[PDB]
Amino acid sequence: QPEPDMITIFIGTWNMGNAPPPKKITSWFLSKGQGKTRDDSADYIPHDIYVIGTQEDPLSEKEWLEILKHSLQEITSVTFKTVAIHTLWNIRIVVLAKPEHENRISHICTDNVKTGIANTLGNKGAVGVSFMFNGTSLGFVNSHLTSGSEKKLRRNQNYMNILRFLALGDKKLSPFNITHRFTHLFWFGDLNYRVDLPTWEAETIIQKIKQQQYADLLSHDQLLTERREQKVFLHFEEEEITFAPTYRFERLTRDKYAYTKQKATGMKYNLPSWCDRVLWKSYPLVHVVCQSYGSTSDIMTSDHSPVFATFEAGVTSQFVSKNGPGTVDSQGQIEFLRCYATLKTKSQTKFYLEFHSSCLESFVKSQEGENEEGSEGELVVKFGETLPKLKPIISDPEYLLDQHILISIKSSDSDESYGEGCIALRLEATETQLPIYTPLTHHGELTGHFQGEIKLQTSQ
Numbered sequence: 001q002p003e004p005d006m007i008t009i010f011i012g013t014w015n016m017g018n019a020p021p022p023k024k025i026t027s028w029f030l031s032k033g034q035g036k037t038r039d040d041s042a043d044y045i046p047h048d049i050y051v052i053g054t055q056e057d058p059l060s061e062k063e064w065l066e067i068l069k070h071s072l073q074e075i076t077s078v079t080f081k082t083v084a085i086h087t088l089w090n091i092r093i094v095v096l097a098k099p100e101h102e103n104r105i106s107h108i109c110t111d112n113v114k115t116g117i118a119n120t121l122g123n124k125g126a127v128g129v130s131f132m133f134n135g136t137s138l139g140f141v142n143s144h145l146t147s148g149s150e151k152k153l154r155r156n157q158n159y160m161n162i163l164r165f166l167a168l169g170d171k172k173l174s175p176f177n178i179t180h181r182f183t184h185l186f187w188f189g190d191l192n193y194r195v196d197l198p199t200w201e202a203e204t205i206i207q208k209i210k211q212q213q214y215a216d217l218l219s220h221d222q223l224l225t226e227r228r229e230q231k232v233f234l235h236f237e238e239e240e241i242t243f244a245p246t247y248r249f250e251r252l253t254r255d256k257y258a259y260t261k262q263k264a265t266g267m268k269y270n271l272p273s274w275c276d277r278v279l280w281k282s283y284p285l286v287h288v289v290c291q292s293y294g295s296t297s298d299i300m301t302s303d304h305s306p307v308f309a310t311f312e313a314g315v316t317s318q319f320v321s322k323n324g325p326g327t328v329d330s331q332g333q334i335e336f337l338r339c340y341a342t343l344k345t346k347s348q349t350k351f352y353l354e355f356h357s358s359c360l361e362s363f364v365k366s367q368e369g370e371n372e373e374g375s376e377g378e379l380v381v382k383f384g385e386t387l388p389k390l391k392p393i394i395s396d397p398e399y400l401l402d403q404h405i406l407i408s409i410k411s412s413d414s415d416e417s418y419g420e421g422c423i424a425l426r427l428e429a430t431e432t433q434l435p436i437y438t439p440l441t442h443h444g445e446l447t448g449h450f451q452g453e454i455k456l457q458t459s460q
């Protein structure tokens with residue numbers, strides 16, 4: 001029975017509005033409704049992994065698991081296995097997988113982050129799950145960010161706290177946050193970004209939604225505009241939105257948006273918005289294709305509609321050779337030529353690199369680089385031909401060309417990372433000097449760049 005090189009992943013996000021779900025929620029898991037929807041011919045084909053994020057979830061874990069499993073069994077005639085479930089307040093993540101994957105899944109981690117301080121600590125934050133699927137690391141984050149049209153900067157701060165403090169994946173990757181720890185990272189939830197148009201325009205917005213004309217609304221969506229200005233979700237992807245705003249509906253129909261200020265809303269307007277979103281970030285040159293992104297039309301217990309997204313994702317096998325794991329394969333090596341880091345820092349410490357990868361027995365520290373002043377004020381750290389030769393555990397090109405090297409640039413004075421990035425080994429050639437590049441981030445914000453050349457030697 002061969003190991004897969006692709007799987008499909010279902011991502012769901014639903015703010016349930018503290019109400020129990022209706023009897024039938026299968027449309028969610030079938031990717032049926034508005035937007036980029038799934039073909040009817042696929043309805044019986046189970047996804048490999050289902051990741052369900054809820055917010056304002058009033059159910060017990062047991063109650064929700066029974067609904068989810070019975071839903072999937074009705075669609076697919078498969079009894080899914082529970083990989084993980086984690087709840088913070090009313091924010092919940094459930095991971096289900098096909099039974100045939102039970103012995104492919106390992107290193108399961110869960111964690112949560114509470115956002116805010118005092119007043120603003122007690123219901124917003126995030127839950128997450130990570131695991132290995134054979135040779136591939138997967139991370140999943142469900143966040144419920146701060147509400148209200150005038151709080152986009154708070155949402156952006158919530159995002160930065162969650163990616164700094166959520167403790168998922170390989171703890172040995174100590175310089176790296178969740179935005180670098182996984183082959184594929186999916187981040188979804190009630191992100192709560194709004195369509196920033198004047199309150200007076202509410203009926204105009206409703207008109208536009210009825211005409212399925214979303215362009216003038218999406219051009220004011222706070223998540224798209226903040227992402228374009230590099231304020232949040234740097235280096236994440238989102239599929240184009242082709243479904244109506246998923247908030248704020250009158251319950252028990254989808255015919256009416258309830259936007260007017262009420263005591264129940266703290267006298268705030270809730271103009272129709274795309275609160276409910278799915279984004280992802282995968283390592284460079286790994287296959288990931290979004291195959292659906294949309295909302296349901298027939299699940300009306302909440303003031304939000306459920307959102308679905310599905311993905312094809314490349315996966316790799318748990319590789320064994322005669323040599324590694326448990327030794328190196330002298331027939332493999334990774335060399336770096338003419339490398340330099342460009343950093344936005346004002347500081348003047350020396351810097352060194354760390355190279356982390358599951359193709360190495362352990363991480364590798366470089367010598368300190370040579371600081372020069374760049375022509376436009378920047379710090380340039382030169383490594384020249386000084387970087388250590390990396391010794392992979394396995395030399396087979398079928399394994400090595402699928403790997404990635406994480407890079408941290410660290411201060412010699414504090415050993416703190418000033419920037420993190422990732423290089424793919426999926427090269428156009430072996431035994432050939434080829435340009436490499438990554439942006440560098442710290443706490444998910446841009447801090448610099450790393451560029452140079454690589455020379456990869458495989459057994460072929």
Ligand SMILES: Cc1ccc(CC(=O)NC[C@@H]2CCCO2)cc1
Nearest residue numbers: 224225227228234235236237238
């Ligand atoms: C209109 C707009 C443009 C950019 C972004 C951020 C982003 O990461 N987009 C993914 C790629 C990256 C290169 C351009 O598109 C959001 C919204």
